[PDB]
Amino acid sequence: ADNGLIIGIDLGTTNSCVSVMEGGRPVVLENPEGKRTTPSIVSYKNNEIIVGDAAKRQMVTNPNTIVSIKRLMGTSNKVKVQNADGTTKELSPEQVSAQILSYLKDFAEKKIGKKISRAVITVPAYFNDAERNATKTAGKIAGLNVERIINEPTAAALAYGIDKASREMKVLVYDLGGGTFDVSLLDIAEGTFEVLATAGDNRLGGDDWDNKIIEYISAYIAKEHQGLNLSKDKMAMQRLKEAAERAKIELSAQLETIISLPFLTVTQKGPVNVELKLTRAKFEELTKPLLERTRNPISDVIKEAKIKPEEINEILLVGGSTRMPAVQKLVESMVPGKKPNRSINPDEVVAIGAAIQGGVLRGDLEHHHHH
Ligand SMILES: Nc1ncnc2c1ncn2[C@@H]1O[C@H](COP(=O)(O)OP(=O)(O)O)[C@@H](O)[C@H]1O
Ligand SMILES: [Mg+2]
């Protein structure tokens, strides 16, 4: 009743993910579109509210589609959407976040076959009391008793079982998501976590790598066409965003990718088309400034914690963007001798950790199997 399942939720800037403990193993639950992560995006059409993939498909084209709401959590800023009758609805960050949490809860209940009323939700380590409390409030609005707020790098460490280490460990977490870059140095001793230092940039993420591909496509276009004003064509812009992210993702697995955009826009001489082969080497050249900006935050946490690099016992790669080969190579170069951990899907690892934390809070060793 009050002692039922405690689901784990990663409420991310770009994507969200829900996991639950099942027979002593964390399981990641698929949304109704069959996907293990859900875009953190919400569309409003009066009281019809759409969350996730369907909303992402209109993020450029629909003025009542809300993105990056996490950035406002803990402030008294509002976002505005327009009702059918022309009046304006003001929404708090808590209210919009709550729609994402409600979507996850609803599909999780149908998968599990039970009502759910308890959760652990993750936040960035730098969140203050107001930012944490905003996240608790979003949970409450969605019908979830938020049993604990835990830090994202700590959740990742729980997923890997590092709290069960026999010796004291220093752990470097390099977390490159869609919008933000977080480096954390954790001390794990006696099954408890201490954040020794944090660094990074909350305006650097995978979106920036996409945007460099968009900038490149715009250059290719400019070799044949001037005076397009491409930004005013919202369909063109939505297609460019989708094509860039797709191309980037393919280049994590392959050495080349083809960007194909027939009838992208029109000029007085007919259609503008794109057919462009992008190699991994060219992609890496274009995005080198972005990659290099991730380097100094690693040495920042080493400096602040007053450790030598050899004192780092384990490295965790978190965030979808760490699937990029050049990102993995950079991290290896900064902690010589150590093989980074990426065996747990880096887009799911935070939610998995939250689900483990939920199991522990609920109790019952048959249920969490924490040894
Ligand atoms: N295979 C891949 N290669 C490169 N980038 C990827 C890959 N898979 C996901 N990404 C990127 O990861 C970013 C999202 O990170 P994620 O950790 O899932 O969310 P959040 O930023 O909300 O924590 C996006 O920029 C996405 O394109
Ligand atoms: Mg994240």
Side-chain angles (χ1 to χ4, degrees), residues 1-234 236-366 368-371:
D2 61 72
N3 71 2
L5 291 163
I6 305 174
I7 62 174
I9 297 167
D10 174 4
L11 180 58
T13 301
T14 314
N15 290 314
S16 295
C17 184
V18 58
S19 176
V20 71
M21 187 65 32
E22 189 179 306
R25 301 188 207 86
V27 167
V28 176
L29 302 172
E30 285 183 8
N31 72 21
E33 295 206 9
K35 307 300 177 52
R36 290 160 71 90
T37 64
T38 294
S40 300
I41 302 179
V42 188
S43 295
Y44 290 83
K45 178 188 158 188
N46 278 43
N47 206 196
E48 176 201 298
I49 296 170
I50 291 174
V51 175
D53 301 294
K56 188 179 173 180
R57 293 187 285 266
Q58 297 190 44
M59 69 193 155
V60 187
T61 58
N62 192 322
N64 295 306
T65 297
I66 306 301
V67 299
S68 273
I69 196 64
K70 190 165 169 174
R71 298 184 176 284
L72 305 186
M73 291 287 272
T75 73
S76 67
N77 292 305
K78 297 285 187 298
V79 304
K80 293 175 168 170
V81 297
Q82 188 163 284
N83 298 315
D85 71 1
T87 57
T88 304
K89 179 188 286 175
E90 288 194 333
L91 296 161
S92 66
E94 290 88 342
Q95 288 174 305
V96 179
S97 292
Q99 295 289 340
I100 302 161
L101 299 172
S102 293
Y103 177 86
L104 300 167
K105 179 196 190 298
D106 288 349
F107 81 71
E109 288 176 336
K110 294 181 194 305
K111 285 282 175 186
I112 295 162
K114 304 204 179 198
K115 293 186 75 61
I116 293 156
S117 61
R118 310 176 80 190
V120 169
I121 310 181
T122 57
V123 297
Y126 59 78
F127 266 20
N128 62 23
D129 289 353
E131 296 165 319
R132 291 169 194 272
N133 286 337
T135 307
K136 294 179 174 194
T137 296
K140 185 181 190 197
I141 291 165
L144 296 168
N145 191 247
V146 174
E147 299 289 344
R148 197 172 282 182
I149 294 288
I150 65 170
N151 293 331
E152 288 161 24
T154 300
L158 289 171
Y160 279 100
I162 302 184
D163 58 313
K164 305 189 216 185
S166 49
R167 68 189 201 286
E168 200 173 305
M169 303 280 271
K170 290 179 168 71
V171 179
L172 184 72
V173 185
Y174 176 109
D175 183 339
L176 188 61
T180 66
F181 172 52
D182 300 294
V183 184
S184 306
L185 192 69
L186 303 184
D187 190 62
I188 309 173
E190 308 187 355
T192 67
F193 296 86
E194 183 185 355
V195 180
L196 298 177
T198 65
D201 184 341
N202 75 331
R203 304 287 277 285
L204 180 60
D207 289 346
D208 298 292
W209 279 253
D210 297 354
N211 292 347
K212 275 290 173 202
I213 298 177
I214 297 171
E215 194 183 339
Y216 186 64
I217 294 162
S218 289
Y220 175 74
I221 289 171
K223 293 176 190 177
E224 302 291 345
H225 307 283
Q226 295 81 50
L228 294 189
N229 208 322
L230 204 51
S231 302
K232 297 284 186 303
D233 187 336
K234 306 311 171 189
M237 291 290 93
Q238 185 75 44
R239 288 174 72 189
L240 283 161
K241 172 56 181 181
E242 292 183 11
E245 193 182 2
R246 180 178 297 115
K248 172 186 76 183
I249 290 170
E250 184 154 63
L251 293 173
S252 294
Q254 303 302 150
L255 299 175
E256 62 179 43
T257 190
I258 305 293
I259 294 158
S260 180
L261 300 158
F263 294 86
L264 179 63
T265 192
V266 191
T267 74
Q268 280 67 225
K269 294 300 199 78
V272 174
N273 317 298
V274 180
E275 301 281 358
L276 180 51
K277 182 182 281 194
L278 182 63
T279 66
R280 185 182 289 173
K282 182 56 171 187
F283 173 63
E284 290 173 345
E285 184 192 331
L286 292 167
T287 57
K288 195 172 211 315
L290 306 173
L291 178 69
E292 287 301 315
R293 188 168 174 74
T294 76
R295 191 179 296 278
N296 205 239
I298 297 168
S299 59
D300 283 340
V301 301
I302 292 174
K303 183 177 204 74
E304 185 175 343
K306 300 173 166 162
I307 62 154
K308 300 184 194 170
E310 69 182 344
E311 297 180 71
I312 295 168
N313 300 110
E314 295 288 341
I315 306 158
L316 313 182
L317 296 180
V318 180
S321 300
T322 62
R323 299 177 180 277
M324 293 196 281
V327 171
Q328 294 176 31
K329 176 179 188 191
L330 178 147
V331 174
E332 289 173 8
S333 76
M334 297 295 285
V335 192
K338 286 283 175 184
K339 190 181 188 297
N341 287 271
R342 64 189 171 78
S343 59
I344 300 179
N345 281 345
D347 55 336
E348 306 175 0
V349 68
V350 174
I352 290 164
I356 290 163
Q357 177 70 91
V360 169
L361 292 174
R362 186 184 187 206
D364 192 343
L365 275 65
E366 194 181 48
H368 54 79
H369 295 248
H370 206 70
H371 59 259

